[PDB]
């Protein structure tokens, strides 16, 4: 017993080493509260959901729809949310995260336990190399080697992006796992040539080389390229995961709570992938501490062949939590106290709130 | 909140029917909390590859030494350990998973349905099966209930006879009743095509596993050409089977059963695969007593089941090994919402009905 | 003549322990036949354990078969499959015993009952799996002084590949090198691993991915540049047809335990032949009884990939009076009535578990 | 025991003439077996004529087999197929004689050599093909005094459909009505004709289109609302697998002549079973020898569609000492050593061609 009596949200702009986060605080009738985060990148340049539209969905639609409803019935709450609201998975993710945080506090259990239990309490976290200068990247990756790196490419001519990558592989490749992310930039022709070259040089994983508008090409590449392919934008929900797998895609999926609608909702996609023999990867939308740890609790319950990229907090100069997660030796420690394991620093929350 | 499994006990129990052999398990944690579970089948080895004695064997010789000493609150870790060391034996795994969930539910003061994300419904529909082998007897029985869904078992007689049998029941329990049939793998491809066409034509709403699980190809073809819904049973046990069949083009519904998947939580993966693929859901049974039946109901409660459930197993027994049975009424069963499964073991009965 | 009685024992024998389920079937005409159903590591490699196999025989197959005509294998098989789902290991032991007894009754070796042996000497490879590359190479070198099967999949991919590469370079010149991943690899690892294996010259890759992913197995068979051997992916003739129809190309690891016996496995073999799929005489590491039973069946077929019937060579002792003669990478097939081996009652009772 | 001699005669027996190719194989141990290879209409229905069948036996199979061990069917079969392409009719006769002889040597009926009979009495339907509806109905009514096969395809579609329709009306309530188009319909006629046949209650439609169009046969089996029986489209286990993999659903008309003998045909049967294809005991209108040889094989299998082994009933005389017993829509399978039939020397010499 206990219902959701209040839902608050704020658009927070925190300084980066500005990132806009949509923070939510949900209060249950039993006095317990929970927090959640929905963050994206580049306004509307990378996703259809912007911070202001995410805020809007929570305030005008999710709040009145959920207030008064039993707060512990995740399945019933999710059915209601999906039945009354199409898409808007980022907004839903923030809400679902807050619900789990509050429920965990009410039971004295970490979200991971609510999700069936953690397979591990320390998760691997890779580092992305994208300084714009090959020399810097190699240097930065070199200090960390003193074990997995993600290179962002697709913004330059193919020849230059390949030279850049090859340089990094030859310098770091024998001691680290090299992955690249083209984030939809390549057309089918460039994709085929680029992927063949990336595979030939030793790249371990190629992320979303073609547009999500061309899953047919993605499938073809996964069946012809001699290295692993990681689907990102091509797969958001369990429905997408089944569809792409059925179509013949082979490789891995970049799981993201924001694309699926939450720490719990993303698990359906995970199990569908597993059933189809698709590998798993813990993805991010560059969330701050709240959204990152929320994702981590879910990732902890699954075997993640490809690791995770939950380094979002490490890109911020400041966050809205009182205590940040602890990162060390290419890993992040998963809190195991009640709920998410982090708390809202109200002073910082107000300081960074947009308006 | 946390504890390790200290002991695991199991008994083969033979209970009288209106005997059905149940494999009951009691798992004891280091905090003193106990959880119970049930693994039951039909007709020894005639319907499945796991018999009551082999199930008992799997629990005693393999699952027990594998799980004792392990944290009992971490179902994901325990499941990975179980599947990593034990191939198949989903019936045995289901009894253990059920007990683990029962115990952690009691530990959190929550019903299993809540541990599974929450119940969408706390009262579930339960149809009745007509399988007396006599058309007249079946109609009478069904007539009594109509004073709403019936599952007719066929496939034991010549096609013409089974079709006349079903047609008679359809005419009699006409308007106010959903008629489903279960051939349980009995038909060859040719007989199945003819039989299924006739069944669809007479108004049957669902045809369960018309052909052999050795011929999923035929099952898929039938689901694409037959003018009524097809329900897969033996053709789908785990989420892996579920994905494969759907990818192959099967359209219709899946008969979810905790025994086939490995428990109340494990079966949920199959359910999600089905949902992602547009395949309907049905709450199936292996004719479990009260323990296995309620374990299944807790899982079924968290899902939208278009085809309802067939959890009438307890109603076929003259006695069970629980202190208090579930309450059935008006084509439904009430789902307990107390901590754990909501049912308690009656030790006096347990010992009385134990085989040895 | 009818089946009058069926006895079974779980026997734990010492290795260089292996648990065998031995069966003795008694016909109404005084003739007895023996059979064996053995697996590896309890329930770690298959769904049928020694105790579950014993249970199937004692509680279900015995009461089902007692009183039935013992010479009608077709009728007996139909009855068994009609009343018993799966449990192919138990059935294999029973079918073996029926054939052994039948052969004795007719004064013919089991191979003759199965239509006649094409050869009486079968090739037997050796498996290198000490976990140590240097040891494996040494051991294989001692034999070349010519087919080896390497077990991998228990370590990081790079390690297993380096391990296999070292063995191929040292023994590859004069020996067929095959590997067995026994379902260990996920799809991505499988693609990379298989390509690397093919590139280094491995002749056959056995069950690289999980039986839960026949789609991956099919894909790999169509793209990898070396032969793929299906094991767990194919047990019965039904599986054999399905996988072939799906597009799998390569070979099948025939095992009497997976199919239900020396005769039952022949149906899978014919389905494979019809589909252009190669054959391999597989084992579950059976003792002398189950090994010779498999051998009689294998003798009747063209086995492109040979056999791995070296199970008895891993035992310090067995429950038979006289073992099979292994020599020069081959094993001699007995041609006396029945299986050609007899149960040593003292050892049987000595090694019986209960 | 080796094959010492092989004799063969082209025999022309009177009908109610049919040309049979009879074989007698003598083993070094004095035991002999007989076989039969028969066809219909010279070369109008198959590629193997009685004279070509005789030639294959005399000029090729005989020198190939003489001197070889007579009890190893597998070895003999590999030798025969390795040296001779096709010519399954000739091989069937030789294989039958080998089994007959082996059975006598072991004191077992051929069915037992094939693993055991599931039944010793098999259903036999009657073919109505007088070309006249009235005559067909009369003959059918006389037999009902359980299953009929109507031959059609030689006339206009509307003519054949009205014909079958009349027969279904007259005999349909007391018997299973099947039709055989024997490859006569083009694809368009087949679609229209098969839909009409299904709608009027026909239980099985045999080979409606040409074997040159398996694609059409597959399409029809997937859209027609009644069972389809493949005949010319499937002869060997290879054909059986290919057609099944292509998507064909229905049944196969097994024939020892098409596969190469009572044993050889079993591989096709197992492939069909593995793929979920039903079985039917087919005939080329063999006399008693060829017919009983088929029956022994059919007895070991579950035949959902029965058999059409009525060949002997069309003859005024045969070359056997004692004919099979047909009664109550069935035929009795002899269970004495070998085939269970003996060659009648006088009748044999009397009917030998030249
Ligand atoms: Mg992306
Ligand atoms: Mg069933
Ligand atoms: Mg294996
Ligand atoms: Mg024909």
XYZ file of C-alpha atoms in Angstrom, chain B:
356
model
C 16.758 -9.198 3.701
C 19.750 -11.383 2.946
C 20.413 -15.001 3.853
C 21.995 -18.121 2.425
C 20.244 -21.374 1.584
C 20.935 -23.742 4.466
C 18.817 -26.698 3.497
C 16.661 -28.079 0.705
C 14.201 -30.926 1.264
C 11.908 -32.586 -1.274
C 9.272 -35.313 -1.267
C 7.322 -37.178 -3.908
C 3.710 -36.871 -2.817
C 0.903 -39.024 -4.186
C -2.428 -37.298 -3.674
C -5.816 -38.808 -4.603
C -7.805 -37.398 -7.516
C -11.586 -37.026 -7.807
C -3.393 -40.381 -7.837
C -1.464 -37.322 -9.007
C 2.231 -37.296 -8.072
C 3.655 -33.976 -6.911
C 7.293 -33.213 -6.152
C 7.234 -30.759 -3.260
C 10.232 -28.799 -2.053
C 10.956 -26.868 1.127
C 13.974 -24.586 1.120
C 15.311 -23.327 4.435
C 17.369 -20.140 4.672
C 19.958 -19.197 7.302
C 17.537 -16.589 8.677
C 15.025 -19.335 9.454
C 12.673 -18.436 6.607
C 11.360 -21.324 4.513
C 9.994 -21.286 0.981
C 8.034 -24.025 -0.762
C 7.658 -25.067 -4.369
C 6.134 -27.707 -6.614
C 7.170 -29.580 -9.757
C 4.442 -31.796 -11.190
C 3.795 -33.535 -14.490
C 1.199 -35.737 -16.160
C 1.451 -39.499 -16.635
C 5.063 -40.226 -15.728
C 7.010 -39.874 -18.975
C 4.061 -39.988 -21.379
C 3.675 -36.213 -21.720
C 7.097 -34.782 -20.906
C 10.715 -35.916 -20.574
C 10.838 -35.196 -16.832
C 9.236 -37.737 -14.490
C 8.459 -37.206 -10.793
C 11.351 -39.475 -9.826
C 13.853 -37.809 -12.195
C 12.694 -34.404 -10.965
C 13.252 -35.541 -7.371
C 16.656 -36.896 -8.412
C 17.679 -33.577 -10.009
C 16.766 -31.737 -6.804
C 18.458 -34.172 -4.405
C 21.673 -34.998 -6.279
C 22.380 -31.811 -8.224
C 20.431 -28.695 -7.286
C 20.792 -29.192 -3.525
C 24.584 -29.386 -3.322
C 24.852 -26.643 -5.951
C 22.700 -24.134 -4.043
C 23.462 -24.798 -0.370
C 25.630 -21.990 0.973
C 24.644 -19.535 -1.769
C 22.904 -16.204 -1.074
C 19.190 -17.040 -1.259
C 17.958 -13.503 -1.986
C 19.704 -13.069 -5.342
C 17.483 -14.834 -7.882
C 19.531 -13.609 -10.869
C 22.788 -14.979 -9.434
C 21.106 -18.255 -8.416
C 19.471 -18.666 -11.831
C 22.780 -18.102 -13.648
C 24.414 -20.669 -11.363
C 21.600 -23.172 -11.893
C 21.535 -22.839 -15.682
C 25.302 -22.789 -15.933
C 25.591 -26.119 -14.111
C 22.321 -27.832 -15.030
C 21.059 -28.380 -18.580
C 17.289 -28.596 -19.001
C 15.468 -30.052 -15.990
C 13.152 -27.030 -16.022
C 10.561 -28.820 -13.873
C 13.077 -29.253 -11.032
C 14.321 -25.674 -11.517
C 10.750 -24.370 -11.386
C 10.120 -25.964 -7.973
C 13.324 -24.387 -6.641
C 12.693 -20.957 -8.184
C 9.191 -21.026 -6.723
C 10.511 -21.809 -3.243
C 13.182 -19.112 -3.530
C 10.514 -16.577 -4.486
C 8.185 -17.778 -1.709
C 10.942 -17.255 0.871
C 12.090 -13.845 -0.364
C 8.453 -12.769 -0.514
C 7.960 -13.685 3.135
C 11.231 -11.839 3.846
C 9.892 -8.612 2.308
C 6.328 -9.069 3.522
C 5.205 -9.123 -0.102
C 3.333 -11.588 -2.325
C 5.318 -13.166 -5.175
C 3.262 -11.168 -7.700
C 4.674 -7.980 -6.140
C 8.220 -9.335 -6.401
C 7.430 -9.895 -10.087
C 6.559 -6.238 -10.571
C 2.981 -6.142 -9.347
C -0.321 -7.760 -10.212
C -2.397 -6.262 -13.009
C -5.277 -8.410 -11.778
C -5.865 -10.131 -8.434
C -8.685 -12.376 -9.708
C -7.888 -14.576 -12.708
C -10.153 -16.491 -15.105
C -9.959 -20.280 -15.070
C -11.643 -22.405 -17.730
C -12.731 -26.022 -17.307
C -11.567 -28.993 -19.356
C -14.033 -31.496 -20.774
C -12.257 -34.825 -21.226
C -14.479 -37.601 -19.845
C -14.288 -39.316 -23.214
C -18.087 -39.141 -23.421
C -19.809 -36.391 -25.423
C -22.985 -36.594 -23.331
C -21.075 -36.477 -20.046
C -18.966 -33.517 -21.214
C -21.992 -31.512 -22.347
C -23.762 -32.147 -19.037
C -20.750 -31.029 -17.013
C -20.367 -27.964 -19.212
C -24.106 -27.372 -18.987
C -23.810 -27.228 -15.207
C -21.171 -24.488 -15.392
C -23.245 -22.468 -17.857
C -26.003 -22.238 -15.245
C -17.799 -19.642 -19.749
C -14.713 -21.118 -21.429
C -14.082 -24.806 -22.052
C -11.046 -26.735 -23.276
C -11.847 -30.016 -25.019
C -9.217 -32.713 -25.272
C -9.188 -34.724 -28.478
C -6.752 -36.635 -30.648
C -7.290 -40.044 -29.037
C -9.865 -41.212 -31.583
C -10.336 -41.187 -35.362
C -10.620 -37.674 -36.799
C -14.250 -38.092 -37.864
C -15.204 -39.198 -34.366
C -13.299 -36.401 -32.604
C -14.801 -33.808 -34.959
C -18.357 -35.052 -34.374
C -17.620 -35.008 -30.647
C -16.422 -31.403 -30.751
C -19.206 -30.272 -33.098
C -21.798 -31.660 -30.660
C -20.271 -29.743 -27.760
C -20.028 -26.555 -29.812
C -23.735 -26.758 -30.705
C -24.770 -27.512 -27.117
C -22.559 -25.028 -25.232
C -23.095 -22.645 -28.129
C -23.504 -18.905 -27.658
C -22.376 -18.289 -24.060
C -19.147 -20.300 -24.151
C -15.664 -20.027 -25.650
C -14.706 -23.426 -27.026
C -11.039 -24.376 -27.312
C -9.623 -27.782 -28.250
C -6.318 -29.435 -27.403
C -4.990 -32.212 -29.648
C -1.758 -32.401 -27.633
C 0.484 -33.363 -30.586
C -1.734 -36.220 -31.811
C -2.197 -35.242 -35.459
C 0.033 -35.810 -38.445
C 0.298 -32.876 -40.884
C -2.433 -34.094 -43.262
C -4.910 -34.928 -40.491
C -4.058 -31.616 -38.849
C -4.818 -29.531 -41.936
C -8.184 -31.235 -42.403
C -9.002 -31.264 -38.694
C -8.008 -27.654 -38.091
C -10.027 -26.399 -41.077
C -13.116 -28.199 -39.762
C -12.608 -26.901 -36.227
C -12.231 -23.325 -37.441
C -15.348 -23.722 -39.586
C -17.501 -24.894 -36.665
C -16.490 -21.892 -34.564
C -13.726 -23.215 -32.311
C -11.867 -20.188 -30.894
C -8.506 -21.821 -30.287
C -6.735 -25.019 -31.354
C -3.894 -26.141 -29.069
C -0.785 -27.969 -30.350
C -2.560 -29.797 -33.211
C 0.658 -31.342 -34.524
C 3.863 -32.796 -33.067
C 6.559 -30.587 -31.565
C 8.763 -32.572 -33.976
C 7.046 -30.598 -36.730
C 7.108 -26.889 -35.849
C 7.168 -26.360 -39.613
C 3.614 -27.742 -39.794
C 2.551 -25.692 -36.757
C 3.735 -22.498 -38.469
C 2.024 -23.369 -41.754
C -1.231 -24.122 -39.944
C -1.046 -20.834 -38.002
C -0.738 -19.007 -41.322
C -3.570 -20.807 -43.140
C -6.141 -21.877 -40.504
C -9.033 -19.468 -39.936
C -8.925 -19.462 -36.144
C -6.252 -19.064 -33.463
C -3.496 -21.624 -32.832
C -2.058 -22.157 -29.334
C 1.493 -23.510 -29.082
C 2.253 -25.782 -26.106
C 4.970 -28.445 -26.430
C 6.490 -26.423 -29.299
C 7.503 -23.679 -26.873
C 9.043 -24.075 -23.424
C 11.701 -21.387 -22.983
C 12.241 -17.832 -24.201
C 14.706 -19.312 -26.705
C 12.000 -21.571 -28.197
C 9.606 -18.645 -28.101
C 11.882 -16.430 -30.167
C 12.676 -19.177 -32.678
C 9.021 -20.053 -33.370
C 7.989 -16.397 -33.740
C 10.924 -15.648 -36.069
C 9.842 -18.653 -38.132
C 6.505 -16.933 -38.746
C 4.203 -18.511 -36.162
C 1.169 -16.399 -35.334
C -1.260 -17.116 -32.516
C -0.577 -17.641 -28.816
C 1.791 -19.403 -26.420
C 0.781 -21.646 -23.521
C 3.035 -20.286 -20.768
C 3.884 -22.859 -18.070
C 6.304 -22.334 -15.200
C 7.388 -25.997 -15.404
C 8.469 -25.655 -19.047
C 10.432 -22.435 -18.492
C 12.004 -23.054 -15.095
C 9.751 -21.106 -12.736
C 7.525 -18.045 -12.098
C 10.322 -15.595 -12.970
C 11.927 -17.540 -15.822
C 8.604 -17.858 -17.639
C 8.354 -14.048 -17.789
C 11.199 -13.850 -20.333
C 9.191 -16.085 -22.680
C 6.154 -13.882 -22.050
C 8.063 -10.717 -23.027
C 9.426 -12.367 -26.190
C 5.867 -13.288 -27.108
C 4.667 -9.743 -26.456
C 7.470 -8.214 -28.504
C 6.561 -10.518 -31.408
C 2.796 -9.890 -31.260
C 2.015 -13.377 -29.913
C -0.837 -13.761 -27.406
C -0.584 -15.238 -23.908
C -2.288 -18.110 -22.048
C -1.716 -19.310 -18.467
C -0.943 -23.010 -18.780
C -0.728 -25.888 -16.302
C 0.802 -29.320 -15.817
C -2.106 -30.004 -13.440
C -0.203 -28.799 -10.371
C -1.723 -28.934 -6.904
C -2.237 -25.722 -4.913
C 1.455 -24.806 -4.506
C 2.443 -25.027 -8.175
C -0.878 -23.556 -9.239
C -0.628 -20.432 -7.076
C 3.042 -20.063 -8.057
C 1.854 -19.930 -11.679
C -0.980 -17.523 -10.842
C 1.402 -15.010 -9.242
C 3.266 -14.870 -12.569
C 0.083 -14.832 -14.682
C -1.249 -11.893 -12.633
C 1.505 -9.622 -13.894
C 0.591 -10.194 -17.552
C -2.249 -9.426 -19.995
C -3.563 -12.920 -20.778
C -5.861 -12.732 -23.793
C -6.718 -16.426 -23.593
C -7.157 -16.639 -19.818
C -5.739 -19.550 -17.805
C -6.337 -23.242 -17.142
C -5.335 -23.266 -13.471
C -7.927 -25.796 -12.265
C -5.394 -28.405 -11.148
C -6.357 -28.229 -7.433
C -10.008 -28.874 -8.311
C -9.126 -32.344 -9.617
C -7.771 -33.490 -6.250
C -9.673 -34.895 -3.278
C -6.926 -33.577 -0.985
C -3.720 -31.513 -1.173
C -0.680 -30.847 1.024
C -1.514 -27.222 1.912
C -3.268 -26.018 5.060
C -5.684 -23.758 3.148
C -6.710 -24.179 -0.532
C -7.304 -21.378 -3.046
C -10.832 -20.050 -3.460
C -12.408 -20.634 -6.874
C -15.748 -19.118 -7.905
C -17.683 -17.847 -10.920
C -15.081 -19.032 -13.426
C -12.280 -17.389 -11.454
C -9.642 -17.940 -8.793
C -8.582 -15.428 -6.152
C -4.877 -14.621 -5.979
C -3.532 -14.420 -2.411
C -1.752 -11.153 -1.621
C -0.144 -12.086 1.695
C 3.660 -12.545 1.947
C 5.181 -15.089 -0.429
C 3.000 -17.529 -2.347
C 0.220 -17.127 0.190
C -0.101 -20.848 0.941
C 1.343 -22.901 3.787
C 2.474 -26.522 3.966
C 0.321 -28.898 6.043
C 3.017 -31.165 7.485
C 0.553 -33.787 8.679
C -0.801 -34.167 5.151
C 2.661 -33.888 3.606
C 3.867 -36.879 5.597
C 0.613 -38.786 5.132
C 0.782 -38.544 1.328
C 4.558 -38.868 0.942
C 5.354 -41.866 -1.253
C 8.239 -42.956 0.982
